[PDB]
Structure formats: C-alpha cells, structure tokens
C-alpha cells in the first residue's frame, strides 16, 4: 500500500531568557521513528523504534548536527515573528513545522508537504505544485515575498522530491520487523424505564480510522446516536464505541455496523443475551 514520511518540528518560547525549547519528531508511515529534544541532558536524535537501531553512529551525528541548525533557525524565526505581530516581551509563543512526502503503492512521490504554524495557526504553506506559497495573514505576506525572492520553494522542492523520497525508500527497506481488524460487540446498559442503551464497541484495531453506525429499518440513525473519539488503548491499537437509546424488548431490531480497512467486508452485529 501507500507510504509516508513526516518531520513535525516545534519551538516554544516562555518568559525568561533562557532560550526556546526545540523538539523534532520523525514519523515513517504515521509511526514515530526518531526524536530530538533540546531539553535533554545531551541533545541528540535518538531511535524511537527498534528497526532504527540499524543506523550507525555516523547517521546520529549527522542528524544531530542538522537539528542544532534547525534549532537556531527556529530561534531566529520566533524572534522575527514577535516583530511581525507587534507582540511585546512577556508571553509564550509556538512555532511549528510539518515537512515530508507521500508515496503511492508504486513508491513514486505522490505529494510533498511543507507547512508552518504560529501560535497553533496556519502561517505559510508550500502549495502542492511545490512552486507557490499560501499565506493567509497580512504578516505572513512579508515572509511570502521574501521567500519568492530568495527562491525558498525550489530549495524545499529539491528536498521533498529527492532526499525525502530517497530516505523514505531506505527506511521502508530497513523496516520489515500491517492492519489489525476490529473486534466488535454490543453491551447492554439500563436506562430510564422503557428505554435501554445499546453500546457497540470496536477494539483491537489499527490504524485508528474506523466508522461505527447504528441502523433501524434501516436507515442509519445519525441523529440521536452517541459516540466517542477514537482513543489509543496504549498497546498500539485503538478503541471506539457508538451507542443508542432503545425501547426494552425491541433490541433485536437494531444493528451495529463497523467499517475498517482491515476488514474483508463491514461487520454487522447486534445484542446477544
């Protein structure tokens, strides 16, 4: 199937120079694989998955050096942004970046990403063409004009089309040691007399994406249905449930459906006493 790599980078300032804290996290196929954190005693890129321990000390030293440069870039940018937004000294501020690439099942580049956020809000983003920039804010225009003149987009295009794809191909070869299908069941819960709660659980699944539906007649009952956001069990898998209020006795009339990419086809089930 398809593959991806991402680097999520953050710098956070707090009042009191001291310098900002810089954290970099790498992901391959939406799973953390490397991590740098400037708060560490001896700041380094560290492996975060067993398959990454293959890499020798030359890798870790190269990447650590890059992280130190990125840390400085974030410092300077954070300071520039304070001026752009006429923010005074005395506050907390956040600068974030997402960079990386999507590959198809054929391992060809499908899309490059290069986005920034300030205070948790979109600041500037390289468009899918990898040539032009989207910048909402009036302040972000200063940046966009600068980066048009500096040829920033071509620089990042080169990394996204080259190094990103190259390195992702490498990491995909190094990592051989999936989907986990959900296991669903309905639980019976009492409610205000006459009514009951049927709650459909999905457990043990990976990736997190899943849909739960209740039907009568049927006729999906989105209106009054209750659910929770998909949550990590903590073991690498996810949980979710959906529930509905139902007249007592007439519970065999309602059916829960579970849609997941790991399934050969959707699961259909109901309460079994």
């Amino acid at each position: 199937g398809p593959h991806s790599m991402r680097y999520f980078e953050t710098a956070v300032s707090r009042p009191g120079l001291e310098e900002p804290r810089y954290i970099s996290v790498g992901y391959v196929d939406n799973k953390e694989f490397v991590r740098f954190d400037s708060d560490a005693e001896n700041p380094r890129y560290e492996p975060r998955a067993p398959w990454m321990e293959q890499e020798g000390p030359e890798y870790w030293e190269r990447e650590t050096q890059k992280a130190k440069g990125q840390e400085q870039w974030f410092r300077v940018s954070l300071r520039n942004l304070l001026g752009y937004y006429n923010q005074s000294a005395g506050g907390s501020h956040t600068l974030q970046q997402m960079s990386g690439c999507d590959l198809g099942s054929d391992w060809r580049l499908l899309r490059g990403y290069l986005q920034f956020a300030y205070e948790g809000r979109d600041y500037i983003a390289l468009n899918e063409d990898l040539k032009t920039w989207t910048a909402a804010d009036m302040a972000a225009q200063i940046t966009r004009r600068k980066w048009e003149q500096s040829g920033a987009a071509e620089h990042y295009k080169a990394y996204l089309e080259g190094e990103c794809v190259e390195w992702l191909h490498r990491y995909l070869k190094n990592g051989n040691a999936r989907t986990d299908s959900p296991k669903a069941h309905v639980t019976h819960h009492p409610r205000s007399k006459g009514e009951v709660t049927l709650r459909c659980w999905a457990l043990g699944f990976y990736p997190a994406d899943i849909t739960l539906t209740w039907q009568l007649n049927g006729e999906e009952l989105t209106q009054d249905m209750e659910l929770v956001e998909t949550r990590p069990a903590g073991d690498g898998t996810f949980q979710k449930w959906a529930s509905v209020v139902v007249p007592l006795g007439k519970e065999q009339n309602y059916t829960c459906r579970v849609y997941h990419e790991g399934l050969p086809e959707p699961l259909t089930l109901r309460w079994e006493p």
């Binding site: 752009y84 970046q97 990042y156 390195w167």
Partner: peptide
Amino acid sequence: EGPRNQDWL
C-alpha cells in the same frame, strides 16, 4: 532525514 530550512520567516 529531515529538511534543512532555507531563509528565516
């Protein structure tokens, strides 16, 4: 491997 950023914001 992660990007090396170009010009500052």
